[PDB]
Design a protein around this ligand. Structure first.
Ligand SMILES: Nc1ncnc2c1ncn2[C@@H]1O[C@H](COP(=O)(O)OP(=O)(O)CP(=O)(O)O)[C@@H](O)[C@H]1O
Ligand SMILES: [Co+2]
Ligand SMILES: [Co+2]
Ligand SMILES: [Co+2]
Ligand SMILES: [Co+2]
Length: 442
């Protein structure tokens, strides 16, 4: 029943760029998103990961965190966390009820001379839940872009920009620098010490746009590979061991229970951000404790061994190519089947090209999202890349995992051919598969 209420709220929200509507809303709410400081995160890849890593580090320094991330894998409750944990279905419905009278008021005034969107409502809910809790610090992931994103009403003292690349596709030719300009809109002038912008690895045309917004906000800049960096990296049971240069010193023997070189870069970004936020040297026992407490559900998360099954939320070519490098470099798979479902706004082809050298075959399917690519359209795309005989189809995710399983069975029984299944292509595919392995939202 808490659950009935939770489905009931999801259903209304699903029946739904200026900042006018979200600003008026926050004003009516009493401006709760200005009652605590925030670390605000934009970029194409790693935003969720970095947000979780940041939350873990601030929690290891003993401040109470609120964290809003997107999209969710399994349950909307995951969008609003307090102390490192999603709020409950009851608190989420309660948070929705508390703000609804003011949302209705904004809907009506706006209609009397455009209702609020689902994301605007979710953002308001997270901000209001943060003030209700109350928290010491909020970690705020951008829904989309940044300049006109619902979250962009906070004037965050730290703004983090993770690697920028292609994800949502409107054109074939890349306006890399128009994309960068919109993300950088989360770098705002401070009201009180200057805004710090903490920037991951970018291509030069991105770098130049980020730098010039930072100028316009008179914002102090910390960029990866100049002001901080991953110095050393070593594969370990469960993850990796890092030696990191932060803003305030070298931190050694950081155990990070996550796979992938890309997660080493997210980690050092999360560190510089938290140093920027507290003004860093941070206590190294706390940095180590925080990184060891990090989880990132549905990002190269191992569901089981024998056979080994991974879910990964890779949905763009840079993500797909980070997934393939990790699978090839940090494991020793003799045989790998991919289970794949992708949404129609993605660079489907660039994903398939990134994964083809690592997947012996791929089973394509439909993840149950209304925005998913239909099985036939994906099998054709996949066929052009893999060749027709390395592509199978299945009606839904559970069938697709059954087909892949018997492919790993057949390969296990084949002496001249340490096997695995990797489920990927979308946040929704990794989230639906995570629910099938029975895991709780996290
Ligand atoms: N720094 C990075 N560079 C390249 N790929 C990365 C990356 N960080 C994460 N990824 C890949 O991107 C996928 C999404 O990571 P997250 O860490 O979820 O990105 P994100 O929040 O920017 C978008 P989303 O949360 O919509 O999936 C991961 O499963 C991983 O494959
Ligand atoms: Co995200
Ligand atoms: Co579009
Ligand atoms: Co000690
Ligand atoms: Co053989």
């Amino acid at each position: 029943d808490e659950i009935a209420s939770l489905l009931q709220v999801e259903h209304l929200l699903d029946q739904r760029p200026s900042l006018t509507r979200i600003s008026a809303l926050m004003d009516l709410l009493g401006s709760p998103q200005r009652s605590y400081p925030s670390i605000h995160i934009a970029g194409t890849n790693g935003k969720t990961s970095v947000a979780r890593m940041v939350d873990a580090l601030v929690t290891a320094l003993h401040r109470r965190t609120g964290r809003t991330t997107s999209p969710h894998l399994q349950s909307p409750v995951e969008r609003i966390s307090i102390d490192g944990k999603p709020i409950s279905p009851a608190q989420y419905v309660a948070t929705y009820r508390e703000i609804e009278p003011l949302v209705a008021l904004i809907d009506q005034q706006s209609q009397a001379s455009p209702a609020m969107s689902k994301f605007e409502v979710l953002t308001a809910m997270a901000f209001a839940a943060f003030a209700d809790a109350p928290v010491d610090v909020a970690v705020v992931e951008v829904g989309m872009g940044g300049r006109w994103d619902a979250t962009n009403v906070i004037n965050a003292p730290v703004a983090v920009i993770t690697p920028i690349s292609i994800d949502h596709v409107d054109y074939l030719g890349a306006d890399i620098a128009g994309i960068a300009g919109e993300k950088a809109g989360i770098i705002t002038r401070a009201p009180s010490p200057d805004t710090v912008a903490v920037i991951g690895r970018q291509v030069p045309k991105v770098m130049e746009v980020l730098l010039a917004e930072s100028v316009r906000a008179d914002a102090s800049v910390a960029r990866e590979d100049s002001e901080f960096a991953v110095l050393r990296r070593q594969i370990a049971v469960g993850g990796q061991v890092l030696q990191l240069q932060g803003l305030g010193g070298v931190y050694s023997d950081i155990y990070l229970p996550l796979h992938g070189e890309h997660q080493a870069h997210n980690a050092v970004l999360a560190l510089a951000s938290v140093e920027a936020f507290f003004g860093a040297q941070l206590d190294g026992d706390a940095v180590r404790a925080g990184f060891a407490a990090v989880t990132s559900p549905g990002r190269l998360e191992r569901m089981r061994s024998a056979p080994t099954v991974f879910i990964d939320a890779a949905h763009n070519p840079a993500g797909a190519s980070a997934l393939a490098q990790t699978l090839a470099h940090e494991f020793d798979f003799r045989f790998l089947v991919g289970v794949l479902s992708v949404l129609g706004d993605k660079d489907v082809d660039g994903i398939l090209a990134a994964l083809e050298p690592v997947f012996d075959s791929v089973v394509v399917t439909h993840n149950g999202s209304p925005r998913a690519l239909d099985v036939e359209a994906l099998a054709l795309a996949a066929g052009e890349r893999f060749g027709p005989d390395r592509v199978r189809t299945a009606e839904n995710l559970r069938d697709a995992i059954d087909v892949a399983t018997s492919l790993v069975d057949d390969a296990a029984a084949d002496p001249d051919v340490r096997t695995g299944i990797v489920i990927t292509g979308s946040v929704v595919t990794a989230g639906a598969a995570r629910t099938l392995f029975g895991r709780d939202p996290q």
